[PDB]
Design a protein around this ligand. Structure first.
Ligand SMILES: Cc1cc2nc3c(=O)[nH]c(=O)nc-3n(C[C@H](O)[C@H](O)[C@H](O)COP(=O)(O)O)c2cc1C
Ligand SMILES: Cc1cc2nc3c(=O)[nH]c(=O)nc-3n(C[C@H](O)[C@H](O)[C@H](O)COP(=O)(O)O)c2cc1C
Ligand SMILES: [Cl-]
Ligand SMILES: [Cl-]
Ligand SMILES: [Cl-]
Ligand SMILES: [Cl-]
Ligand SMILES: [Cl-]
Ligand SMILES: [Mg+2]
Lengths: 317, 320
C-alpha cells in the first residue's frame, strides 16, 4: 500500500537487501557501481545512491591538479580525454565535508607531467591524500590516453607502485587493468596483487582496438579508448581467468560492456564480487542501474541464493 | 621470497630475446623472431645494427645503399612525412665491413639502388656490383626500383628494364632477393611485375615505397612544400590493396612484405591476415617512438593467442 511503501522506500533505500554484501571489509548495498571517469571530481556524490548505484568510483584523480564520441551503431563510446581533474587534494576536501550514504571508491592515476620513473611517489601522494576518506582506492595503470601509463602494468614497474600505495593506507587497495594484456601478464599481476596483499582487481579499462566497429566514419576519429559492448567478451574472459587463479584470495570487480541484467548476472556467476558500468548508463538512463539490480535480485531469489555473496563464482564450482 | 613466475620470464627474455615465441616465423629460409621490421631509409649505412632488436623490431632493412658512395617535412595533421632526400649513403663496400663486424641477433636485410651517376643503360652492372658486396652478409637483398627522388629510377620498374636487373642480381648471390615496388604503379604493371618475380624465382616483394600523390592530405599548404615522396597513413589504403592483389595472385610462390602507413596493432594484424608474411614501418616509428614497435608485436601476439594460432605463419593470409 503506497503511502507505507513510499515511507519504506524513503527510509531503507531503493535496492533489495538481498543485493547487500561485504567486499574487502566494506558494506556495499548493491553490486553495480558507477565506473571511473564520469564523476571525476566528486561533484555528484549524494546523487548516485538515489540513482540505484550500490557505490561510485570517483576519478581518475592525480597528485597535482590538471583542469568523447558516441558510436551508436556499436552502442559504444570513444574517449578522447585524459585525466582532467582538480586533483586528489581537492577531492579529499570534498569527501571530508561528507560522506554519502553508499561507498565511494577513489581512482588515482599518475599526474601527466610526472616522469615514469617518478611515478611511485606521485601514486603514493594521491593515496596519502584521499585514502583516509575513500572506501577503497584503485590504482589506474590502464587508461590509454595518458602517455606511457599502460607501460606501468609491467610487473617490474607495477610492484613498487602497488607496494607504496598499499603501505600508505589501510583503506583497501585495488588495481585497474587493461583488457589487452597477455595471459602471462594477467597471471603475474594477479600473483603480485596476492603477494602484496591487495584487496582486489578491477577489470577492464577501455581498449584501443577498433576491430569490430560498425559505426561509420570511425576511421576518421582520432586516438582514444573504446568502451561498451566491444569489451564484453574480453572482460568476461579476463574475469574467468583471474577468478580461477586467485578468486579465493581477493575480490574481482568486473567492468566493460555490461548492458543488461543477463550480462551482469553472468559476471557475478563467473566470479565478480562487484560490477561497474559507464557506457550502458549513458545509453540507458536512470532506470539503467535500477533495472539491472531488480534483474539480479530476481535471479538470486529464483536461484536458491540467500545472498549475493553465495552467487559469486557459482558457475565455476 | 616471491613465488612469482615473472622473474623467470625475465630470464627467458634475456636468453631468447624480448618477443613472444609465437611471433617467430621462417620466410625464405631466414628466421624472423617477429614480423615488424625497420623499413629502408632510416638506418642508411648500418650504423645502429645492434640497437634494432632493443627497439622492438624483428629485423631491419638497411639502406638504400649504392655501388659507389654518395654521402623532410612532418605532415602533422596526416601523421605523415614528405621526404625530399635521395640516396645519401657511404656505399656497399663500407656497409659490408659493418655487416661482417656485427654479431647477429635479428636478420638484417639490405636494400640496394642504382648509383646516381651511373647511366641507366648501365644500371645492371651497378646493381650487380652492390649485390656482390653485401649479398654474402645480408639476410636478404631488396632491389629498389621505386624511390621517387632518384631521377629515372621508377622507370626501371618496366618489366623490360627490370628483368635484366633482377636477373643479374638473382644470378650473383644465393641470398634471397626481393623487389620493392611503388604504390603508384598501375594494376596491370603490378600483375606483370608479380609474374616476373615468380618467373625469376625471386624470394618476395616489398610493397610499398612512398607515393608522389598529393590526394587525401589533411595538412594545410602541402601543395607548395615542393616535390618528394609521402609516407605514413596516406599510403595505407593503396598499400593494403596492393598487398591483397599480390597475395591473391602470387601468394603461394613468394613472400609478401607490407609497408606503408602501419600505425597500430589493428593495422598490422590486418596486413598479416591479408597475406603479409612480414611488415615494415618508418613513419610510425618517427611518431610512435621507442615503444611503437613493441606495442605492435604484443598486439599481434594477443590476437594470435586469441586466436588460437599456434604460430604467426598460420595467420598469414587467413582473411583470404
Ligand atoms: C568517456 C570515458 C572516460 C573514462 N575515464 C576513465 C578514467 O578517468 N579512469 C578510469 O579508470 N577509467 C575511465 N574510463 C573507463 C571506464 O571507467 C570503464 O572501465 C570502461 O568504459 C568500461 O566500462 P563500460 O563498457 O561499462 O563503459 C572511462 C571511460 C569512458 C567511456
Ligand atoms: C625520410 C624517408 C627516407 C626513406 N628512404 C628510403 C630508401 O632509401 N630506400 C627505400 O627503399 N625506401 C625509403 N623510404 C621508404 C620507406 O622504406 C617506406 O617504404 C615508406 O616510408 C612507407 O612506410 P611508412 O608509411 O611506414 O613510412 C624512406 C621513407 C622516408 C619517410
Ligand atoms: Cl592525462
Ligand atoms: Cl579511454
Ligand atoms: Cl639519388
Ligand atoms: Cl674491425
Ligand atoms: Cl621518398
Ligand atoms: Mg603474366
Amino acid at each position: 500500500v503506497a503511502p507505507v511503501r513510499r515511507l519504506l522506500r524513503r527510509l531503507l533505500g531503493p535496492t533489495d537487501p538481498v543485493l547487500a554484501s561485504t567486499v574487502f571489509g566494506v558494506r556495499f548495498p548493491a553490486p553495480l557501481g558507477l565506473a571511473a571517469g564520469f564523476d571525476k571530481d566528486g561533484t555528484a556524490l549524494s546523487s548516485w545512491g538515489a540513482m540505484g548505484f550500490g557505490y561510485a568510483e570517483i576519478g581518475t584523480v592525480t597528485a597535482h591538479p590538471q583542469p568523447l564520441f558516441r558510436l551508436a551503431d556499436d552502442r559504444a563510446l570513444l574517449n578522447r580525454m585524459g585525466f582532467n581533474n582538480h586533483g586528489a587534494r581537492a577531492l579529499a576536501i570534498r569527501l571530508a565535508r561528507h560522506r554519502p550514504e553508499i561507498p565511494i571508491g577513489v581512482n588515482i592515476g599518475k599526474t601527466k607531467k610526472t616522469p615514469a620513473g617518478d611515478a611511485v611517489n606521485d601514486y603514493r601522494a594521491s593515496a596519502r591524500m584521499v585514502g583516509p576518506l575513500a572506501s577503497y582506492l584503485v590504482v589506474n595503470v590502464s587508461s590509454p590516453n595518458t602517455p606511457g601509463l599502460r607501460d606501468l602494468q609491467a610487473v617490474e614497474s607495477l610492484r613498487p607502485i602497488l607496494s607504496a600505495v598499499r603501505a600508505e593506507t589501510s583503506t583497501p587497495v585495488l588495481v585497474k587493468i587493461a583488457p589487452d594484456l597477455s595471459d602471462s601478464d594477467l597471471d603475474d599481476i594477479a600473483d603480485l596483487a596476492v603477494e602484496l596483499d591487495l584487496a582486489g582487481i578491477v577489470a577492464t579499462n577501455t581498449t584501443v582496438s577498433r576491430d569490430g566497429l560498425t559505426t561509420p566514419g570511425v576511421d576518421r576519429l582520432g586516438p582514444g579508448g573504446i568502451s561498451g559492448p566491444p569489451l564484453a567478451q574480453r572482460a568476461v574472459q579476463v574475469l574467468r581467468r583471474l577468478y580461477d587463479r586467485v578468486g579465493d584470495r581477493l575480490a574481482l570487480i568486473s567492468v566493460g560492456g555490461i548492458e543488461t541484467a543477463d550480462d551482469a548476472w553472468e559476471r557475478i556467476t563467473a566470479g565478480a564480487s562487484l560490477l561497474q558500468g559507464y557506457t550502458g548508463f549513458i545509453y540507458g538512463g536512470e532506470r539503467w542501474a535500477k533495472d539491472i539490480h531488480e534483474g539480479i535480485a530476481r535471479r538470486l531469489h529464483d536461484g536458491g541464493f540467500g545472498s549475493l555473496h553465495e552467487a559469486v563464482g557459482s558457475a565455476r564450482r
